[PDB]
Symmetry: C3
Subunit: 336 residues, 3 copies
């Protein structure tokens, strides 16, 4: 059989300074420890583990609050380290070779999209999330960076981003028109304001309920990738899925996507042939029971396999086995 | 932004004599103890806690079985106390001001609808429930009052209600044509008989499966509130939701509404502008594990927020924050 | 009211040599121990417990591996014992009288279909399962018989079945065109190859997602039972349902049918009037927590009740109770 993607790269980013619950740094390990790699090879894909990006984690004294942001210099230093590594991987990829990134809290997305856009400036972004993650710093109630990662990247938002020297190299590489959200159900007011003002395509769980996921996917792809010309950066927050199916995550919100709805998003996005980067964020194996962690891990693996082209309707074998070749008598043969 | 309802009243009714499992009396506390009030205020709604109705709970000697009914004089005395309090609240409400009632087992509905109809005689009732709760007393296998509350209220059923002096003030204020059921999946035979005989609109989980919830809501509202002329009494039994999402309740039945389907019912009913009373019944925080109770509580809060107009697609902020007003340099400003 | 089936037979088959996890032999007991029998009688169906089939379980020395198969002589001996008993029951059934079989691992299906086809050679098979269970022996990675049961039965597969004397009486009684799958999401490559090559109708969770269960059922029935002329053998693997709703089973796969989707399959299949045999496979009450076992048991009972005609929209009573006959004064009567 033929594959859309025959090889793929894998990268861990154990960010944990974007939100205060310890454990998202164990995200990549949660996936490495799974049968993910084995299942992908069983499908005929050559998957290369490119290791982990080491985040910059400064101490309290070196990284005081600034404009309410917690760990903002850790954030900016990490953003640039991430961007550099992703850019480098995406350029040696130039059948494309998708990069699979396992986080880590969602604050990594500023860095991953930054680097990705360097290699492929024309990209679009599909943001699968219960949350907007597009708070500008003075509007954030939490001061957690994992709630702001897109705001630094969107050109139309720059008049609401306070200036900092160490953020200078974080160049806004996205237009509002290049992003589509699926799964929203917990926007902060100011996000709603920005999303509506600048016309960012979004499809909330309400849209998913009224339209159905099949149409929502079609609409999202239509909105930001009409003729499949652009590379896709698929940013998948695990908390988009329902807590019944992904409990081990920092900010669970009831009424989420079913696993199946999530698989459909990924299957469709994979099948475009334009999946350039997929990142899975906000796994925290330190949250919930042991069985919660397994449910979450399992959901992540199915989700990630779908992204690489796994087909729930089955895969043909590489060589068809035949009974005679082993010198073995078949029942049909025997009946003579 | 504008709201359909800018204020709202909140009332607890800790009924527990309608069914034998202790704990539904802790229902209202389960919700007060939650972030419900905070979330509602965050949406710009002024919510007034009107306290709890104290139920009449007689002892065994004072309240023997009568026609098989358990605690029927506690029921009738409580029905009148409830009716009086609700009538009083709904008249000082005369942008309507919705009343949110947290139970308590479902037997409270005889009282709440009675009083509600006093203030607004022309109402319709949307009954969201896995059960009919319309057993007449000699047909009830359990003798539990929470399985009979509508039978006393429906005019066409009065020839099957045995007469009791203390029930005289429970005047049948509903026509069969004023009620619509959504969510049914466990009707007793005699309920099925009555529901079909007198032509009560009903939509079972089977209808929900074949029609989809969007159409079922439209049909229900069409059946009992064609042009949105009537006040709506929305009686929401928590056990309508699936046990996976509301386990802490006395008579759980598998195959229920998803949380999302429930939210859609409430969102639609809210958006009519006719939500006059909403009541949530059969929470029992004494049932199930600690995590079961949290799941149930959480579902109740999302459900109740939807009823008051909460929007999963987001809310605009009351004042838009701007970076310059604080004397702060934006990144866009800096780039000159 | 009228019933499609007024009586029914019940048979346990505690197979456990088709897969290595101990406990599927407790399947039938799990259902007998439930309120299943009571609920069915409450619907007006006369259900006769025909006891259990005793499987042949040979020791290691007597049953070595052959062509990789584990316990293949236990399998063949059991297949014939099952076939004989089912044939006998289905002939004394000649309003049909459905046979309800509770397993037991799925390897029993070779025997049950064999015997069923003896009594009703013209049957079709609806296979509800996350798995294909149609591996030929040299293609099986596990060597577990519960993954092969259909391969011995399908005429087009016989050139890939190795001959064994003790399998001679296992006569291939099915054509590829007589089988339809619903629920697939974990086919082995060689199954996919066979299913596509010989044109077996199949509807995976992907089809269920895109088409919706209502259409998938219609298509399946169209594919193998166009004008409802054929008896239906409904082979229901509990692991077709989602692990959230049937956790206690040996090979759980995420992203399954909802309980409701499963009920719809059964309701539709029941309503054809052609439900001849229904079998439920792969219950293992030795797996999972106590609450997992209850969830699974409960799902099985609802599923099996649906198969026998249970209606979620309610059942009429056998005799309508009337208030006057007991010499009792109604409220309506009193108001004169
Ligand atoms: N887990 C997430 N987003 O994906 N949290 C964001 C929460 C909130 N919007 C904030 O700024 O903190
Ligand atoms: N929880 C409920 N209804 O909402 N129980 C009612 C059970 C049954 N119909 C009865 O009369 O007791
Ligand atoms: N539980 C099941 N099928 O229903 N297991 C089959 C697993 C696999 N296809 C095999 O041959 O072992
Ligand atoms: Mn996020
Ligand atoms: Mn999120
Ligand atoms: Mn109720
Ligand atoms: Mn109920
Ligand atoms: Mn099976
Ligand atoms: Mn299976």
């Amino acid at each position: 059989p033929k594959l859309l993607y025959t090889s793929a790269n894998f990268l861990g980013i154990p960010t944990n300074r974007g939100q205060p619950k310890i454990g998202t740094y164990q995200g990549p390990e949660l996936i490495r420890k799974s049968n993910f790699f084995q299942l992908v090879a069983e499908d005929g894909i050559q998957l290369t583990d490119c290791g982990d990006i080491i985040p910059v984690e400064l101490n309290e004294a070196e990284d005081p609050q600034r404009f309410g942001m917690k760990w903002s210099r850790s954030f900016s230093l990490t953003t640039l380290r991430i961007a550099e590594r992703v850019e480098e991987l995406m350029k040696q990829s130039n059948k494309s070779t998708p990069l699979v990134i396992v986080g880590g809290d969602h604050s990594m997305a500023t860095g991953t999209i930054l680097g990705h856009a360097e290699a492929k400036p024309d990209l679009c972004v599909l943001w699968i999330d219960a949350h907007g993650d597009i708070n500008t710093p003075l509007n954030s109630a939490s001061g957690n960076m994992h709630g702001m990662p897109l705001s630094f990247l969107v050109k139309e938002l720059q008049d609401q981003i306070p200036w900092l020297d160490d953020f200078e190299g974080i160049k806004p590489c996205l237009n509002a028109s290049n992003i589509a959200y699926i799964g929203l159900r917990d926007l902060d007011a100011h996000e709603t304001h920005d999303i509506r003002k600048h016309g960012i395509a979004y499809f909330t769980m309400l849209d998913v309920d009224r339209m159905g996921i099949e149409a929502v996917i079609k609409e999202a792809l239509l909105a930001v990738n009409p003729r499949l010309e652009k590379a896709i950066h698929l940013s998948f927050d695990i908390d988009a899925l329902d807590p019944l199916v992904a409990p081990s995550t920092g900010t669970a919100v009831p009424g989420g996507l079913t696993l199946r709805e999530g698989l459909r998003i990924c299957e469709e996005v994979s099948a475009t042939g334009k999946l350039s980067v997929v990142e899975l964020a906000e796994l925290n194996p330190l949250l919930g029971s042991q069985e919660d962690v397994l449910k979450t891990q399992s959901s992540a693996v199915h989700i990630l396999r779908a992204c690489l082209g796994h087909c729930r309707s089955g895969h043909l074998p590489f060589k068809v086995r035949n009974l005679t070749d082993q010198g073995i008598m078949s029942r049909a043969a025997h009946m003579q």
